[PDB]
Scaffold this motif. Structure first.
Motif, mmCIF file in Angstrom:
data_model
loop_
_atom_site.group_PDB
_atom_site.id
_atom_site.type_symbol
_atom_site.label_atom_id
_atom_site.label_comp_id
_atom_site.label_asym_id
_atom_site.label_seq_id
_atom_site.Cartn_x
_atom_site.Cartn_y
_atom_site.Cartn_z
ATOM 1 N N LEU A 102 -10.577 -8.411 -6.694
ATOM 2 C CA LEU A 102 -11.384 -9.195 -5.769
ATOM 3 C C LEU A 102 -10.641 -9.366 -4.458
ATOM 4 C CD1 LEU A 102 -12.368 -11.944 -8.330
ATOM 5 C CD2 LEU A 102 -13.657 -9.862 -7.789
ATOM 6 N N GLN A 159 -7.167 -10.990 -5.812
ATOM 7 C CA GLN A 159 -7.177 -11.574 -7.142
ATOM 8 C C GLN A 159 -7.654 -10.539 -8.132
ATOM 9 O OE1 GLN A 159 -9.730 -14.801 -5.720
ATOM 10 N NE2 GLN A 159 -8.258 -16.232 -6.663
ATOM 11 N N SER A 176 -22.485 -19.371 -20.325
ATOM 12 C CA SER A 176 -21.715 -20.401 -19.623
ATOM 13 C C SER A 176 -20.491 -20.890 -20.398
ATOM 14 C CB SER A 176 -22.608 -21.573 -19.227
ATOM 15 O OG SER A 176 -23.589 -21.141 -18.285
ATOM 16 N N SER A 177 -20.402 -20.505 -21.667
ATOM 17 C CA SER A 177 -19.218 -20.794 -22.475
ATOM 18 C C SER A 177 -18.065 -19.845 -22.173
ATOM 19 C CB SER A 177 -19.551 -20.727 -23.964
ATOM 20 O OG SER A 177 -20.394 -21.795 -24.340
ATOM 21 N N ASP A 179 -14.981 -18.302 -20.399
ATOM 22 C CA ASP A 179 -13.880 -18.729 -19.547
ATOM 23 C C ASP A 179 -13.379 -17.481 -18.838
ATOM 24 O OD1 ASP A 179 -11.501 -19.750 -18.418
ATOM 25 O OD2 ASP A 179 -10.428 -19.765 -20.331
ATOM 26 N N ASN A 180 -14.096 -17.072 -17.797
ATOM 27 C CA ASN A 180 -13.723 -15.879 -17.051
ATOM 28 C C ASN A 180 -12.644 -16.204 -16.042
ATOM 29 O OD1 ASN A 180 -15.909 -14.326 -18.248
ATOM 30 N ND2 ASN A 180 -17.246 -15.516 -16.889
ATOM 31 N N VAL A 181 -11.542 -15.481 -16.117
ATOM 32 C CA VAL A 181 -10.342 -15.761 -15.349
ATOM 33 C C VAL A 181 -10.356 -15.052 -14.014
ATOM 34 C CG1 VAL A 181 -7.831 -15.353 -15.266
ATOM 35 C CG2 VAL A 181 -8.921 -16.051 -17.415
ATOM 36 N N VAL A 182 -9.888 -15.759 -12.998
ATOM 37 C CA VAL A 182 -9.559 -15.143 -11.721
ATOM 38 C C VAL A 182 -8.118 -15.541 -11.435
ATOM 39 C CG1 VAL A 182 -10.109 -15.026 -9.258
ATOM 40 C CG2 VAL A 182 -11.949 -15.241 -10.971
ATOM 41 N N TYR B 68 -26.906 -25.057 -23.110
ATOM 42 C CA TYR B 68 -25.515 -25.260 -22.722
ATOM 43 C C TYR B 68 -25.324 -26.646 -22.093
ATOM 44 C CZ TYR B 68 -20.942 -24.739 -20.570
ATOM 45 O OH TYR B 68 -19.632 -24.934 -20.177
ATOM 46 N N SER B 104 -10.162 -19.927 -9.559
ATOM 47 C CA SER B 104 -9.490 -19.363 -10.726
ATOM 48 C C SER B 104 -10.472 -19.031 -11.860
ATOM 49 C CB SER B 104 -8.390 -20.299 -11.232
ATOM 50 O OG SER B 104 -8.950 -21.432 -11.867
ATOM 51 N N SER B 106 -14.754 -17.437 -12.692
ATOM 52 C CA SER B 106 -15.998 -16.858 -12.192
ATOM 53 C C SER B 106 -17.129 -17.161 -13.172
ATOM 54 C CB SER B 106 -15.879 -15.356 -11.958
ATOM 55 O OG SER B 106 -15.652 -14.670 -13.174
ATOM 56 N N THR B 144 -24.981 -21.589 -14.172
ATOM 57 C CA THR B 144 -24.867 -22.813 -14.964
ATOM 58 C C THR B 144 -23.423 -23.000 -15.418
ATOM 59 O OG1 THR B 144 -27.164 -22.686 -15.705
ATOM 60 C CG2 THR B 144 -25.660 -23.926 -17.078
#
Ligand code: NA
Ligand code: NA
Lengths: 188, 184
Positions: A102, A159, A176-177, A179-182, B68, B104, B106, B144
């Motif tokens: 990114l 990033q 939405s659960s 936990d996507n890291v940047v 959610y 940190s 997305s 969301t």
């Protein structure tokens, strides 16, 4: 070091130059672990990575091969040596080509093939390269290929975007659960 | 009043209709803010809103991803987007692959969550991902998230819009966009 390998000296050997010819320079090398993320079951490590500048390429590359993007123009190839450790007793899916770099106004998607020699692909299991065997660690390469303007766009404060493996887990039903890291990922 | 693409209609909370609780619009962008001309498709962001959901009170089916936020606080960010196909041939695009790129974290988009009937982004009657040649499709895209995730995104918020070439059967040629996307 003559032949490419995962060793510290082997990793410095240019697969890119072997394919594109031209004037190729390693402009940045990160030879120590720079990233570890523990997801629910999988841990992803970045073991080392290199940034190579290709100018004035000279070799013939099949026009249909994605590597050919840099056969007729200057650019950069960023090669990551990554490991995926499956801490679970069950096999888990992951698609590392969905990792992205990114920049300021551009992003670059990863490849599990471009500029990666046989023997060095990231393969989770023989039945499915995307399925990572329970208990095992798979090691392999991931590359990002771009033109000079795109490198310049990523040059300061780039990033890396690493998707949560839950995206690929059929039992996970809420996006939405994730936990996507940047994470910071310097390339200069 | 009812939702619409008008400046006042866009303010109507589909989120509250589904979740109840206390829903507040904390940020509103009511003028066109993004345009990218790709090879065949032009994508526009016409307006968008950020809503903070506190203590939802309505029942939501567990098989519906909207759930959610059935039992926690969070945020829903709703975009009104248009896609114009300038080509003479139909083109594929999957706008749910647009993501919000935070400090940190997305968050991936949805063409379904918290979107009222009649306002989905539908490229054609054959396939919502197929965009008819010479036509402009308009509809909603939502993101969301929980409170911590919103706080992370809001610190340094961009939007990542993939080049449509990834959906065209015929990689480094991708002009994937990252654009500023203030949400507070
Ligand atoms: Na950026
Ligand atoms: Na960001």
């Amino acid at each position: 070091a003559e032949a490419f390998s995962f060793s510290p000296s082997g990793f410095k050997v240019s697969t890119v130059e072997s394919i594109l010819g031209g004037d190729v320079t390693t402009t940045y090398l990160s030879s120590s672990k720079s990233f570890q993320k523990d997801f629910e079951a999988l841990t992803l490590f970045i073991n080392q990575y290199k940034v190579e500048h290709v100018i004035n390429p000279t070799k013939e590359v099949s026009a249909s091969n994605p590597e050919s993007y840099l056969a007729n123009k200057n650019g950069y190839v960023i090669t990551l040596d990554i490991s995926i450790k499956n801490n679970s007793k069950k096999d888990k899916m992951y698609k590392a080509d969905q990792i992205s770099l990114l920049g300021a106004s551009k992003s670059v998607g990863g490849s599990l093939d471009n500029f990666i020699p046989s023997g060095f692909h990231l393969i989770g299991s023989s039945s499915d390269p995307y399925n990572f065997t329970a208990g095992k660690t798979a090691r392999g390469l991931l590359t990002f290929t771009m033109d000079e303007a795109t490198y310049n766009d990523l040059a300061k404060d780039s990033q890396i975007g690493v998707p949560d493996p839950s995206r690929f887990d059929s039992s996970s039903t809420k996006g939405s659960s994730q936990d996507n890291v940047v994470a910071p990922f310097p390339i200069k």
